[PDB]
């Protein structure tokens, strides 16, 4: 049967470690795929870790220019949370250099985008076979979440972008049932930019905190209703959560527009808590190093900067990077609410380190109604490798 | 229960990528079987990739003369589509240096041919155990499809050849239920040659587009009816689809006889679309490089050369090779028709490259009702290896 | 449904080998996690071997300072009994540098402790997802069993310590159902010390034989009743069973207090047999070498030293170490009583051997109503490795 | 439910290849256990290949003196037929340096013998856990079949020996249900010797063709009835089938006594066919090289040497060795009779080859109602290895 996922997100006080794969450290001797963009999504029976491979293995010559982000070898696959993205326990998902996945309660639906930049094709799979397709509608690197999509009562949703990484681009919302596309919407967002949305379900609607790679150091937000009507804007909090970004003291919040003259970014996330908000971010304001999640009072509806909680998951002497959302299915947690969880990607190698390769590891954390002490569950791999 | 597979093939506009294993690139460091002749077949629950191994691994000394095509070590095995033909996720099927496999909806049926060339034995397995046998009837390399066989309402069919690779040979159609042979027919085809048939089910009959290794640059075709009555001939299209072959402008089509003075060939395929036809072929007319599928208007019933669609899957600067058919089970696609899919084998190593070994990789594509942009999902391995 | 586990422990005459993983010997060429603290727990369908990894592999540079006992890479995982703690057959459990696991008959419950020493967090998982948390209550290395916890009629129990490894510490009993904590108790034990309890179910109560790392060479014992009321003390036997320890002839037993001026220890175990007791111990009185289990007449209720049975499992020329309890589920053994079993950890590498690493192997033995001959199923690995 | 296995053996005309693992060739680069004594047994769902490991891997230093036959590292494990005895797809069975396994239709029962030679213990497992034990009754290397045991209507049987490898020894028949021993018998066989029995079920009784390592070049035979009453003797055929052995022309058959002055032997097998018999043997009469099975007219009841069929499976230029029986469950073959199958072990390394190690590979063949052509599915590994 289908996963209702109509409950509201659980109000958490802190997050506890769920897993840590140690992908890279292990890959020193083992046969581990070189990856990037790992993320978590759950079925009502287990949670899996999805990832994009370079079709090559750690400590091998094919892991060379594995920094480019795209190639015809790039593939989407998965293992159960905590397992390294190793070859012998991996499941093939889709041919992709950009993906998103989610389970509706019956089967898994994946979306892998591959093909030429000017005419990429996003193939949708369901139950292990392709079912529908979305062709590039703006001829410029069609891309999606790199995080778990969202399924509410059988219908699954996700966000996609097509256009430049700087100036105005084009964004759309997609909705599907059993792998077949059943609706779509264009998101009007002039002056704003949207990418790599980290979504989760809350009170029957789909909430996402994305990435503005054009001019925003604060993150865009969009509440998608089942009928595809929607509300787009920015995380209200008077604190920036993208990288690169300026100081918090130099940042005035804004619920409607981007702020700060930073034109880059990194995939991040946020969880609504009533009117409050749990927002993650790299400790460093310039580099993808360290990770922390802050809970801002009324930070979801106000330009508030009233911090009530702060928990470090990767200190600032260690590499971090991408991070995304997903929720624990009620059939697994037993709760009456949707337990909010996230993962932190820890990128190793180029561009920051002197190695011919680039891959990443991940740590997973979940909701919990207790204050969790600060610590650093960093990658821990020793570079360079037999390079 | 049994898979009806009585529906008609879906009318597709293009094909989207299903998977890509990256077998060879990965095999640079991992433990991957050296293979050749990979192919896809599906059960109503998953699709698998079958392959013939040399009983050796990539980057190992036993992968030496792995070009001979036959040996007592040659084995048939399988993994789920997209997975590399690796040792730790592989399932044993049959002892074979030539095979074919298909699922009837209840269990898997395989056919592995092994033994001496002058007295080979084809052992039939069902549910994981041998059930019946077919001995060489003409004492000269008994062989079969190297592609998915076909099951319609419980009864599975496949084609076999026995005789020389040049002059006249002998071809037969076999039919079985639950692993037990229940009928067979001799195919009268004087002047014609048949090998490595790529079949699929359409409107209750079994349609195949095979390989004439004697004199045909155009491919033979045979519609097998449940009673084993049949229609044999050649793809009508006024365009040749075998390798080697002459220019399209030098080729007059023919629905009844072989044309062009080329005596070699490569396993290829074709899908009927009403009276139209989707035909695959290597871009190069002499080498096994590049892959493309063309849709010819009335190309299945007329000496037509009216091209309506063309899609490249492996450009001409990359190695290609074998390619075969199979269909997506309705229990997986949800469609009311049989989604036509194919795979392209990308051979690396000898004879074209300077290495002591020879293996291949594969990419899988499926039906889809959209035009898919051209691209190249080539092997990508870097030769030579630690050789 | 739930495992009753209300039966009484079976009265055994000796123990027979169940399995031997050969983790280290195999790890010489294979991809085996570097481990420590392995233990066994069973579901009504299979028994698994749990272990703490260093997030690194044998014969790899990351296995360097793998002697420290704790780190942010330390992870809890499992394989089926007898399998080496290898990467490709491993299941992720929890982020932990100290753990305990048990099955209630429906799902697995694990408890992994990680985080800073002064504020560690123990995360509880159930069915593959975290469900509740226990924060360090005394700010000093929160730790637990490193052995199978105990589930009786749905409710699972385990013991935890928090405080110094020398002087007085703090110990508590925890009880949970379906991953959710439902009760807890503080254990009053002034002058006594408790750690790494090896528990099992007997006559509806939970019996444990733990480790006093403060001043006891004899082991503490605690019978936990379903209501969390309890009885704590020491194994009565007039024979010491911890390491280091003094001679048996210099040891007067004691049911209420620790004896001998040894302040260290090693995880060991004991099984009640009516009023008798099966107690394990390293042959050496100073080093963690050799393993043997002795059955003392009335050794559970009297300062008795009347030995009735002695069986060696690892001779004194070989390395041993940790050892813990667990029981065979009646749904697996068919018995009307709870078959008592144990495992012996065989540590290799530092501190005793000249290698840059430290890991361990294990052998498993079970109840049985026959006298089993002495022998040595030692590790057998050849050190040093390619170091 | 239980497997009846009361049908009679199928009358076969020849045997077709079932599988070939290529364990050693693959082990050149992969992580394959060093093995010996591999054998096949089937459940009503799949057939598995059991084997004894040395707790070490091919191409590793621990594979050194792997010729001794026994050690505390020796372990029994299994994979599905055709898979190499690799580490990542292996299942642990029992601690053993001599074993036997069989499925009764509900669960697997294994018997692993380990421990000191003068007091070995055979531990019996069922459903993955030890259930009963058999201690050495004659204090001299307790041993068993090294081949599939036999289950008829829930009760499983097997044969065991204890005593010298030369002069008189002691043999017994064991019978069990659900892992619990329910009966046993002593086999009176003065002047005769019995070892490594290859049994199968036929007409409701258990038939075995064993090995006389004392003075017999012809093989002993024993028909065990459900009540443990029995008939022991020798394969009547006027042709010897053990190794070493004298010429066929120098051999007068004998149904009651051993013949030829050869005191060694090798595990072999035989299938009754009415009053006829299919008997296997190494081609060489002195070395364990080449394998062939001959069908002798009335060879089961008469000193007959009338050969009606001969099929070679491993030519005489290749190494062979052990071989044993088992039957295909009717739930897998669909037949109304019990399809007789066997496996041939192909030993590589010492004592015949210049390597520091010793292991083996296997090929499996099954019943079939057709004449199968001769061929050689030999090991094929290239020695020495990276030694
Ligand atoms: C489809 C694709 O290439 N996505 C890439 C993404 C993208 O370039 C950016 O979001 C601007 O559009 O950037 C990054 C990145 O580490 O910053 C890696 C992604 O693989
Ligand atoms: C059974 C067998 O050896 N088949 C071989 C096939 C055959 O020789 C040809 O079709 C003429 O009969 O050719 C090829 C090939 O790459 O061209 C590889 C096949 O393994
Ligand atoms: C949580 C933790 O670090 N436990 C460690 C434990 C502990 O130090 C001792 O019991 C005193 O408290 O000691 C040992 C040990 O081999 O002796 C290894 C354990 O990993
Ligand atoms: C338990 C045991 O060691 N069995 C061994 C067996 C035995 O020595 C012989 O049957 C005389 O009893 O011989 C052989 C062998 O290759 O010949 C290998 C077996 O492992």
């Amino acid at each position: 049967t289908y996963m209702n996922n109509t409950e509201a997100i659980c109000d958490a006080k802190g997050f506890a470690p769920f897993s840590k794969d140690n992908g890279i450290r292990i890959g020193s001797r083992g046969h581990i795929f070189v990856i990037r963009e790992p993320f978590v999504s759950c079925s009502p029976i287990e949670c899996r870790t999805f990832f994009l491979t370079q079709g090559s293995l750690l400590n091998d010559k094919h892991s060379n220019g594995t920094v480019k982000d795209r190639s015809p070898f790039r593939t989407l696959m998965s293992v159960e949370v905590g397992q390294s993205p190793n070859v012998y326990q991996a499941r093939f998902e889709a041919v992709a250099w950009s993906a998103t996945a989610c389970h509706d309660g019956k089967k898994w639906m994946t979306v892998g985008v591959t093909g030429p930049d000017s005419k990429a094709v996003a193939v949708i799979h369901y139950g292990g076979v392709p079912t529908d397709v979305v062709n590039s509608w703006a001829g410029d690197i069609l891309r999606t979440q790199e995080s778990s999509c969202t399924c509410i009562q059988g219908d699954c949703y996700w966000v996609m972008t097509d256009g430049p990484a700087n100036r105005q681009a084009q964004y759309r919302i997609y909705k599907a049932n059993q792998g077949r596309i059943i609706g779509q919407t264009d998101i009007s967002f002039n002056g704003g930019h949207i990418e790599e949305c980290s979504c989760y379900p809350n009170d029957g609607k789909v909430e996402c905190v994305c990435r503005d790679g054009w001019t925003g150091t604060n993150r865009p937000v969009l509440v998608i209703s089942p009928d595809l009507s929607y509300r787009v804007g920015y995380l209200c909090a008077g604190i920036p959560s993208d990288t690169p970004r300026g100081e918090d003291t130099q940042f005035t919040g804004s619920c409607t527009s981007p702020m700060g003259n930073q034109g880059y970014g990194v995939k991040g996330f946020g969880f609504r808590q009533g009117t409050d908000v749990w927002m993650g971010r790299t400790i460093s304001r310039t580099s993808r190093s360290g990770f922390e999640i802050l809970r801002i009072k009324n930070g979801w509806t106000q330009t508030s900067k009233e911090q009530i909680r702060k928990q470090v998951v990767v200190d600032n002497l260690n590499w971090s990077g991408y991070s995304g959302s997903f929720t624990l299915p009620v059939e697994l947690s037993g709760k009456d609410c949707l337990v909010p969880c996230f993962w932190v990607e820890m990128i190793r190698g180029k561009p920051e380190e002197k190695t011919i390769w680039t891959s990443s590891s991940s740590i997973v954390m979940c909701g919990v109604d207790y204050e969790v002490a600060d610590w650093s569950w960093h990658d821990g791999a020793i570079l360079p490798f037999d390079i």
Side-chain angles (χ1 to χ4, degrees), chain A:
Chain A
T1 300
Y2 286 137
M3 274 194 62
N4 288 324
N5 277 327
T6 52
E7 296 71 41
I9 286 293
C10 297
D11 176 42
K13 283 190 181 188
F15 300 75
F18 182 165
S19 64
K20 187 182 198 309
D21 57 50
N22 282 146
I24 303 175
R25 286 166 55 91
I26 298 175
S28 188
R29 153 154 275 220
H31 300 165
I32 309 303
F33 281 105
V34 171
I35 70 167
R36 193 59 230 294
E37 296 73 41
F39 67 81
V40 186
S41 186
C42 309
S43 70
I45 269 183
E46 59 170 47
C47 293
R48 305 184 62 75
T49 299
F50 297 89
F51 51 84
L52 296 180
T53 74
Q54 288 288 346
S56 51
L57 299 196
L58 285 176
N59 243 332
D60 180 64
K61 61 183 191 172
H62 294 275
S63 68
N64 200 191
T66 49
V67 194
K68 52 180 172 181
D69 291 320
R70 301 184 298 292
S71 77
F73 316 131
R74 217 73 204 293
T75 246
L76 169 66
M77 301 187 263
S78 70
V79 298
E80 307 163 350
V81 267
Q83 299 181 324
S84 52
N86 68 78
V87 176
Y88 312 132
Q89 290 181 315
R91 163 190 295 178
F92 185 86
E93 302 290 351
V95 180
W97 36 244
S98 176
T100 184
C102 44
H103 199 114
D104 54 20
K106 295 183 182 191
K107 307 175 192 177
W108 281 100
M109 176 192 79
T110 60
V111 176
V113 190
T114 187
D117 308 59
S118 74
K119 289 152 62 61
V121 62
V123 176
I124 303 171
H125 301 228
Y126 190 68
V129 307
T131 49
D132 214 340
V133 178
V134 177
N135 279 318
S136 180
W137 74 85
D140 194 0
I141 306 182
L142 168 66
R143 42 200 190 287
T144 192
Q145 301 184 39
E146 312 304 21
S147 169
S148 180
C149 33
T150 316
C151 305
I152 300 177
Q153 297 179 305
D155 297 326
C156 304
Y157 316 63
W158 69 104
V159 184
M160 297 191 95
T161 300
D162 187 337
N166 328 300
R167 51 180 304 142
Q168 262 297 317
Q170 274 177 34
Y171 340 88
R172 289 179 170 174
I173 305 175
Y174 278 92
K175 176 184 185 189
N177 164 263
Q178 299 169 69
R180 287 296 145 65
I181 297 174
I182 60 179
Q184 62 178 74
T185 310
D186 277 299
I187 303 178
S188 183
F189 205 46
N190 297 316
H193 195 247
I194 301 176
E195 281 184 348
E196 310 179 307
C197 293
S198 301
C199 315
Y200 56 103
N202 200 1
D203 292 313
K205 299 181 174 172
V206 181
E207 301 182 359
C208 315
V209 195
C210 325
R211 156 188 175 174
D212 175 328
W214 183 8
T215 69
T217 75
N218 56 332
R219 298 189 179 290
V221 153
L222 89 161
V223 185
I224 304 168
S225 299
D227 71 326
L228 260 32
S229 64
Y230 67 84
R231 300 184 198 188
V232 63
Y234 286 73
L235 232 198
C236 294
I239 287 166
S241 58
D242 196 5
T243 304
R245 63 170 184 290
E247 300 180 0
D248 303 326
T249 300
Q250 297 291 174
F251 189 80
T252 303
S254 181
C255 296
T256 64
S257 310
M259 294 177 71
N261 281 318
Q262 302 292 48
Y264 190 62
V266 73
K267 176 176 175 54
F269 79 97
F271 282 104
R272 211 236 302 160
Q273 300 278 252
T275 55
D276 281 31
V277 66
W278 271 113
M279 62 168 66
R281 73 185 190 171
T282 72
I283 288 180
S284 171
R285 296 171 302 200
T286 301
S287 295
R288 293 182 173 180
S289 55
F291 201 80
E292 47 175 42
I293 187 172
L294 313 175
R295 174 167 188 158
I296 304 304
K297 178 97 172 175
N298 297 310
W300 187 276
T301 58
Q302 288 172 53
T303 187
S304 170
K305 38 190 56 191
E306 178 166 2
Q307 177 178 306
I308 302 176
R309 299 187 185 293
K310 173 179 165 77
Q311 179 179 160
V312 177
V313 162
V314 188
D315 64 56
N316 204 187
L317 288 188
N318 292 289
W319 303 117
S320 62
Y322 276 23
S323 47
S325 52
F326 72 104
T327 299
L328 289 178
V330 176
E331 300 84 357
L332 286 178
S333 73
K335 302 288 197 63
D336 50 292
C337 52
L338 296 179
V339 178
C341 309
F342 70 92
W343 45 271
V344 179
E345 166 191 48
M346 306 170 113
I347 301 168
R348 299 311 297 290
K350 293 182 59 188
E352 250 78 62
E353 291 167 284
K354 184 158 289 180
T355 64
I356 69 177
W357 57 278
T358 297
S359 192
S360 60
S361 182
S362 71
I363 177 189
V364 184
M365 311 289 290
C366 274
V368 149
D369 301 15
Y370 301 75
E371 256 199 313
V372 181
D374 288 21
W375 211 41
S376 175
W377 287 282
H378 48 266
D379 193 55
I382 312 176
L383 304 194
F385 270 17
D386 293 357
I387 219 72

